[PDB]
Design a protein around this ligand. Structure first.
Ligand SMILES: COc1cc([C@](O)(CCN(C)C)[C@@H](c2cc3cc(Br)ccc3nc2OC)c2cc(OC)nc(OC)c2OC)cc(OC)n1
Ligand SMILES: COc1cc([C@](O)(CCN(C)C)[C@@H](c2cc3cc(Br)ccc3nc2OC)c2cc(OC)nc(OC)c2OC)cc(OC)n1
Ligand SMILES: COc1cc([C@](O)(CCN(C)C)[C@@H](c2cc3cc(Br)ccc3nc2OC)c2cc(OC)nc(OC)c2OC)cc(OC)n1
Ligand SMILES: COc1cc([C@](O)(CCN(C)C)[C@@H](c2cc3cc(Br)ccc3nc2OC)c2cc(OC)nc(OC)c2OC)cc(OC)n1
Ligand SMILES: COc1cc([C@](O)(CCN(C)C)[C@@H](c2cc3cc(Br)ccc3nc2OC)c2cc(OC)nc(OC)c2OC)cc(OC)n1
Ligand SMILES: COc1cc([C@](O)(CCN(C)C)[C@@H](c2cc3cc(Br)ccc3nc2OC)c2cc(OC)nc(OC)c2OC)cc(OC)n1
Ligand SMILES: COc1cc([C@](O)(CCN(C)C)[C@@H](c2cc3cc(Br)ccc3nc2OC)c2cc(OC)nc(OC)c2OC)cc(OC)n1
Lengths: 34, 43, 234, 81, 117, 50, 81, 81, 81, 81, 81, 81, 81, 81
């Protein structure tokens, strides 16, 4: 169960999406509120 | 004050806080000496 | 206790994917995206901030303070989004496990298993952070300069130790997150072996404290990401 | 033959968790002792002490949870069997 | 034996040798007896000093803002204001201790502690 | 079946605990913060008027 | 075969609980030493000192709990049985 | 068969008591060290210094008791016997 | 036969005494460290400090005796015999 | 015969990981206690204290993972198998 | 049958003295640390420091002695042999 | 015959590295605690404090190395095979 | 039969030496830490400090020696053979 | 017979070196902690502090050395074999 799997990429991709959204939807808005 | 260096202990609770708490006392005692000496000169 | 056996497993592009872990990661991603969108719609500079605005503001302020105190924000503007997204992702992933999404087969099955309980999720996050701050170090030092500083570290004659510590940065950063959540997945399973009339007590206390444990793990993972960035950039 | 390997794996996993628990408990106690002493000396320092604290804890917990993970490998997916 | 000297800012209050000294430093109580290592310590705002005079009875002193120093030859107690146990007025000390001002209340409670209340 | 009932009782306990002892402090922090920011914007507006 | 695995599981659970007890007891002792020292130094900080304390106690007692769970896995639900 | 299980259970209970005794003794010693130092620094603190103490001891005595219980299960009610 | 049970009981009781000795020695040494430091920093408080001291030594030396009560149970009674 | 080899290798790897966990956790706790205390006393020293700290932890972690690197060699390679 | 019990008794006595020596050494070191530090800080109180010292050591040396005695009982008068 | 010999060698090497890991980790943590405390109290002293530090870590990490070496002798060149 | 007793005696003597070494090393380190600190803060006091120190090291090195004796009794004059 | 004795000797030597490494590492860490603290507080003490330190280290490493020797005796000149 410690051996990685394809889900690795399937997770990374998803994380990147969040990293993108928070990079602009929350980075921008939050910085603006600040 | 100028820090004077000349050629040639334990502390509670540390040296830095004690030094900070003592310097005002040094100022007070030197002002007290000044006032006493001014009273003597006045007399 | 039947450790492992990821459900919804499928195969694509000639490689296997744990369907349940992907589903949990997608659920966490959509929760985080909903929070981000609700902030974006209701982000007010002049008005009274909403609940999500306060949450995002506090998280961003904490991460920005960490960056300021470790490596200047001018040098590391790109690490604040990384820290914030990491923190929210892990926090939501861990906290969504607190919901009663488990049932009995006759072994105990769980509709939503925390994605960090899977090695792929934590390894992906750790390796992404690893590549990210190593690339940041390369950018701020150079392709050849950065490896030399990494090997040398702060003490040259400890060169091998550094080379281990460096490789220890991702591994620990992954496994520290893995075992903490993986372990939980077992306890809830173990506590499931109890009958319903006494199962609620150990389960209740364990998950009540697991809320704080997951919060602390997300905070630690983000904090160590920021610290590794500050180390590798200068 | 599998019984002996299983018993050895159980003993090894017990050793792993015993060492991990000793290290986690004692290191966390020491770090929290530093935290409590700092908050006693400077009660206004609490906010700034959670960063170096959870860093320390973050290190200590690793030595535990890594070990925990490997015990599972010892116990549920015994390397030899 | 210890050469104990208690030096108020205005005058040298008392300079009698003694076998044992005791007072509450900012870090807790402290007892000084011959050949103690050199030391400097701020006393708590309400500290009191016991000096175990070899011949006569004990000497209990209320001290305000004291600083204790230890050196192989002497034990010094520098003081802003001090009073021996015999001159303390219990009612006056009680009245002062009720004041909200930190300094006056501290002095009053120190006078009470020296008085043995 | 039984596992679900036991875990659901446990989750009710968790919800009660957080609502009684964890929710109040977090709500107080949010009200101090959000409410305080509202008050500050108000003060700024009054000062501009002045 | 079952006897060997059960004996190994008992020894492993004994190791788990011994390590957990050592870690929890020593970490609790260290954290409470910090708490006692702080409340001696700053009695008015008593309450302020109970936040970093229960967090530290929360960190060690969590580990202990996990240990107590895994022993229950070794002893009553021997994984390799 | 039962002989092997009983021997393993006895070894496990011995380990449980060893760890519990180490943790209890050392944690109680540390907490008592804090208490003694606090009382030495100032007498009037004693009354308050016993609240954090009995708390810490309560945490350190609980663990021992838990171990004290589980050996009673290991030897008198050996699971898997 | 029960010879294996007897050997396991002897090993378990040896573990009990080893852990009890470690815990008692270290914990009461820590308590004595506190007592000696308190007497050195305030030689007039000796008798005072003997109240908390003998409390913690009471907790530290109790754990030993309890362990002493169980090793005797292990080797002389061997409950699982 | 390989069953005994695997059981011994598992017990040895468990000992390796337990010792590594104990050492790493306790040493990291001690170093982080120093770090937290130094930051509490002098917050501005934070960045100054992380240079030596991460050297010391850098050694401590290296004691852990190196041991882990050997545990793998015990369980996955099992020299003498 | 007596060989197994004898080996178990030897291992148990080894554990007994291992724990006894660990406790004795560490507790004596801690008490001596207290004594040396107090004599350095308050040399005139050297005598008054020996009553709380030999007491503490007297406890520690007791814990060792008892263990030693039982080790003899384990090796020369092996119970259940 | 060789199977038992190399299984015992594996357990012994695991013990060697467990002890080496515990000693190295805890000693390095203690020396690092000293170094961090010295740098925090005397910011300008850092360059100096690395000579006493690496001497300390020199003696500590030396022991570990020896243990590691000997494990190889235990593991890859096991005596008495 | 003699082989089993010899192996058990070797394990027990190894336990005795491990415990004696741990106790001796840690207690000597603690006593020497006291001595080094006292001589750092009181350069001219080292003479007096060597009186209690050698007393402490007397109680520590003594225990080790006793262990060193009995291990020989375990290894060369195995009581049970 | 020979195999059992050799395996027991290997385990005993592993215990010897594990305990020796624990003691050496932790004692060196504590002695070097005192040395580093003294040198940080007292620069000119650096020359004077290396005499007590070398004594302390001398008492610590000696124990390690002794253990090492005996471990060799266990594994290269296994008594009773
Ligand atoms: C006789 O009393 C106990 C106490 C326990 C504890 O484990 C503490 C033991 N320790 C001090 C050595 C305890 C506990 C659990 C924690 C779990 C996490 Br995650 C984080 C912090 C914790 N802190 C804890 O105490 C501070 C605990 C466990 C539990 O399990 C169903 N139910 C509880 O009721 C709420 C409970 O609190 C009393 C267990 C037990 O069983 C043998 N008997
Ligand atoms: C000599 O007498 C004893 C004492 C005990 C204790 O365990 C303490 C031992 N220790 C000092 C090493 C003790 C105890 C239990 C606690 C449990 C929790 Br959770 C939290 C704090 C505790 N504090 C405790 O003492 C402060 C205890 C246990 C118990 O078990 C049925 N019944 C008790 O009667 C209420 C009891 O109190 C006397 C056990 C025992 O068994 C052989 N003999
Ligand atoms: C991949 O990194 C390492 C490092 C080591 C060390 O052992 C330290 C381990 N520790 C930090 C837990 C390390 C070492 C050895 C020392 C020996 C003496 Br005597 C005194 C001080 C020492 N300090 C040391 O580091 C502080 C070491 C070992 C070695 O082996 C041939 N070669 C070295 O030089 C090339 C070497 O130095 C870097 C071991 C190892 O094995 C897997 N991997
Ligand atoms: C080589 O010398 C020794 C010394 C011992 C001691 O145990 C000390 C062990 N330590 C150093 C770890 C020692 C001892 C015992 C105490 C018992 C109690 Br209760 C309280 C205090 C004690 N203090 C002790 O030393 C101060 C001892 C034991 C004993 O056994 C019949 N007879 C003694 O009288 C001659 C004796 O000396 C008073 C044992 C031993 O055995 C091989 N060889
Ligand atoms: C040298 O002689 C001893 C002494 C003991 C002790 O255990 C202390 C050992 N330790 C110092 C390592 C001791 C004891 C027991 C305590 C129990 C509780 Br609960 C709380 C505090 C205690 N404090 C204790 O001493 C401080 C003890 C036990 C006991 O049982 C048969 N009878 C006693 O009276 C005859 C007795 O002396 C009061 C045991 C023993 O074993 C052969 N030999
Ligand atoms: C660096 O590589 C080493 C070092 C050693 C030491 O043991 C120290 C190990 N430690 C730091 C963990 C070392 C030693 C022995 C001492 C004995 C007594 Br009694 C008192 C103090 C001692 N201090 C010692 O160093 C501080 C030693 C032993 C020895 O034996 C063959 N020959 C030596 O001369 C060359 C020697 O000095 C280098 C052993 C070794 O072998 C595998 N490899
Ligand atoms: C040459 O290196 C050594 C030293 C020892 C010691 O045990 C100290 C070990 N330490 C570092 C843990 C040492 C010793 C014994 C003591 C016994 C009592 Br009771 C009280 C105090 C003691 N103090 C001791 O040293 C201060 C010792 C024992 C001994 O036995 C035959 N012969 C010695 O004379 C050559 C001898 O040196 C005085 C053992 C050893 O084993 C081969 N090699």
């Amino acid at each position: 169960f410690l051996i990685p799997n394809g889900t690795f990429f399937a997770v990374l991709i998803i994380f990147l999406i969040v990293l993108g959204v928070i990079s602009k939807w929350v980075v921008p808005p939050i910085s603006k509120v600040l | 004050m100028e820090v004077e260096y000349v050629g040639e202990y334990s502390f509670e609770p540390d040296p830095e806080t004690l030094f900070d708490a003592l310097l005002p006392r040094y100022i007070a005692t030197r002002v007290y000496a000044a006032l006493l000496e001014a009273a003597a000169s006045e007399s | 206790i039947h450790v492992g056996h990821h459900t919804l497993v499928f195969e694509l592009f000639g490689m296997t994917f744990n369907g349940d872990t992907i589903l949990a990661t997608a659920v966490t991603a959509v929760i985080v995206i909903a929070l981000a969108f609700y902030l974006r719609a209701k982000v007010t500079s002049t008005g009274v901030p909403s609940g999500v605005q306060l949450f995002w503001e506090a998280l961003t302020i904490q991460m920005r303070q960490q960056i300021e105190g470790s490596i200047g924000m001018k040098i590391a503007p790109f690490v604040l989004p990384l820290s914030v997204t990491i923190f929210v992702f892990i926090l939501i992933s861990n906290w969504l496990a607190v919901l009663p999404l488990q049932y009995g087969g006759g072994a105990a099955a769980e509709l939503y298993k925390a994605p960090a309980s899977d090695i792929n999720f934590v390894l992906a996050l750790a390796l992404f952070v690893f590549v990210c701050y190593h690339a940041a170090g390369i950018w701020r030092r150079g392709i050849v300069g950065h490896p030399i500083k990494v090997v040398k570290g702060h003490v040259a004659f400890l060169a091998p130790i550094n080379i281990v510590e460096e490789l220890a940065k991702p591994i620990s950063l992954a496994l520290r997150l893995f075992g903490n959540i993986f372990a939980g997945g077992i306890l809830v399973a173990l506590i499931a072996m109890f009958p319903w009339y006494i199962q609620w007590f150990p389960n209740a206390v364990w998950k009540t404290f697991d809320l704080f444990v997951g919060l602390i793990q997300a905070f630690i993972f983000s904090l160590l990401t920021i610290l590794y960035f500050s180390q590798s950039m200068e | 033959p599998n019984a002996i390997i299983t018993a050895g794996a159980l003993i090894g996993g017990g050793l792993i968790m015993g060492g991990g628990a000793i290290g986690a408990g004692i290191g966390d106690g020491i770090a929290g002792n530093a935290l409590i002493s700092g908050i006693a000396r400077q009660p206004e320092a609490q906010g700034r002490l959670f960063t170096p604290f959870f860093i320390t804890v973050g290190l200590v917990e690793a030595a535990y949870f890594i070990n925990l993970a490997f015990m599972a490998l010892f116990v549920f997916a015994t390397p030899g069997l | 034996d210890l050469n104990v000297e208690i030096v108020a800012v205005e005058r040298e209050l008392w300079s009698g040798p003694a076998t044992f000294v005791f007072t509450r430093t900012t870090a807790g109580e402290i007892g000084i007896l011959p050949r103690h290592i050199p030391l400097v310590a701020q006393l708590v705002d309400d500290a009191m000093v016991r000096v175990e005079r070899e011949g006569e009875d004990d000497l209990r002193i209320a001290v305000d803002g004291g600083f204790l120093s230890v050196t192989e030859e002497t034990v010094r107690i520098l003081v802003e204001n001090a009073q021996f146990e015999s001159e303390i007025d219990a009612d006056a000390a009680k009245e002062d201790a009720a004041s909200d001002d930190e300094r006056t209340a501290a002095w009053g409670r120190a006078r009470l502690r020296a008085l043995g209340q | 079946m039984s596992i679900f009932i036991g875990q659901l009782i446990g989750f009710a306990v968790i919800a009660f605990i957080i609502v009684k002892w964890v929710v109040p402090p977090v709500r107080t922090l949010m009200r101090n913060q959000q409410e305080a920011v509202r008050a500050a914007l108000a003060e700024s507006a009054e000062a501009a008027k002045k």
